[PDB]
Design an enzyme around this catalytic site. Structure first.
Site, PDB file in Angstrom:
ATOM      1  N   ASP A  17       0.806  -1.317  -0.003  1.00  0.00           N
ATOM      2  CA  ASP A  17      -0.094  -0.056   0.049  1.00  0.00           C
ATOM      3  C   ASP A  17       0.719   1.293  -0.034  1.00  0.00           C
ATOM      4  O   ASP A  17       0.080   2.181   0.352  1.00  0.00           O
ATOM      5  CB  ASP A  17      -0.832  -0.048   1.259  1.00  0.00           C
ATOM      6  CG  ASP A  17      -2.303  -0.854   0.980  1.00  0.00           C
ATOM      7  OD1 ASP A  17      -2.416  -1.277  -0.110  1.00  0.00           O
ATOM      8  OD2 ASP A  17      -3.147  -0.775   1.992  1.00  0.00           O
ATOM      9  N   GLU A 113      -3.398  -5.644   0.912  1.00  0.00           N
ATOM     10  CA  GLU A 113      -3.928  -6.018  -0.428  1.00  0.00           C
ATOM     11  C   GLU A 113      -4.687  -7.433  -0.569  1.00  0.00           C
ATOM     12  O   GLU A 113      -5.018  -7.993  -1.500  1.00  0.00           O
ATOM     13  CB  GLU A 113      -3.209  -5.559  -1.689  1.00  0.00           C
ATOM     14  CG  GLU A 113      -1.828  -5.691  -2.107  1.00  0.00           C
ATOM     15  CD  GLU A 113      -1.159  -4.566  -2.743  1.00  0.00           C
ATOM     16  OE1 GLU A 113      -2.005  -3.606  -2.410  1.00  0.00           O
ATOM     17  OE2 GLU A 113       0.001  -4.507  -3.189  1.00  0.00           O
TER      18      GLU A 113
HETATM   19 MN   LIG Z   1      -0.320  -2.544  -4.106  1.00  0.00          MN
HETATM   20 MN   LIG Z   2      -5.127  -1.765   1.387  1.00  0.00          MN
END
Ligand SMILES: [Mn+2]
Ligand SMILES: [Mn+2]
Length: 178
Positions: A17, A113
């Site tokens: 992220d 993710e």
């Molecule tokens: Mn990513």
């Molecule tokens: Mn995320």
DNA sequence: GCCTTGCCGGGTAA
DNA sequence: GTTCCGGCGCG
DNA sequence: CGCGCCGGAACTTAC
DNA sequence: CCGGCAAGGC
């Protein structure tokens, strides 16, 4: 140490992220950035920031943890040439992570993710090579999985964790904090 | 009957 | 998620 | 002169 | 990241 565990988890967050940015400004100014972005202000300040701060103390990094507010996300940022190469070098040696490091990194990457309904167990990434590595790690930990191209619009691959090995995954990876 | 997992479009959270 | 900007500090 | 921390925020897209 | 759908298999 236990520093390597916290580091591998943070690197999971960063790769998932955020990012590692080596910038060049006019002139010839420069900056090195360690970044995690996230929507939740509470998650960033109460869980992620203290772990980063612990790491900064350990490495005697003198930079401060910046939290910057964008309209759609909070950006945690450390401006530090040192913290930068620390993670950057750790990334290029990722294939040599020990088991405690693998688990921490997969957890970090899943927090960023992974599929968070847990109805399904999935990790999305453009980086096929990175998923193939996480795939090998999961297979050694007894978690079967598959990789394929999921989104043709953005070249995004998905790593799908077989729900047959659901319980071993949720306990070994998600529910272990060392 | 039901679980699993590849497919793929919407748009939030990066 | 990524890369601009103007600022400042420092040998 | 050259280079590295700060504080944004606009800009872009991978989940 | 989410989540509806549909195809394969026990
Ligand atoms: Mn990513
Ligand atoms: Mn995320």
């Amino acid at each position: 140490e236990n520093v390597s565990g916290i580091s591998a988890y943070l690197l999971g967050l960063i790769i998932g992220d955020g990012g590692l940015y080596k910038l060049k400004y006019k002139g010839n100014r420069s900056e090195y950035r360690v970044v995690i972005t996230q929507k939740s202000e509470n998650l960033i300040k109460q869980h992620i920031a203290p772990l980063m701060q612990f790491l900064i103390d350990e490495l005697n990094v003198k930079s401060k943890i910046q939290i910057v507010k964008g309209d759609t996300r909070y950006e945690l940022r450390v401006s530090s040439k040192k913290l930068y190469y620390y993670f950057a070098n750790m990334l290029e040696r990722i294939r040599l992570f020990n088991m405690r490091e693998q688990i921490a990194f997969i957890k970090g990457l899943y927090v960023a993710e992974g599929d968070k309904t847990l109805k399904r167990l999935r990790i999305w990434n453009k980086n096929k090579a990175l998923l193939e590595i996480v795939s090998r790690w999961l297979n050694n930990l007894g978690v079967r999985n598959t990789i394929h191209l999921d989104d043709h619009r953005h070249g995004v691959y998905v790593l799908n964790i077989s729900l047959r090995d659901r319980i071993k995954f949720v306990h070994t990876i998600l529910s272990s904090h060392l």
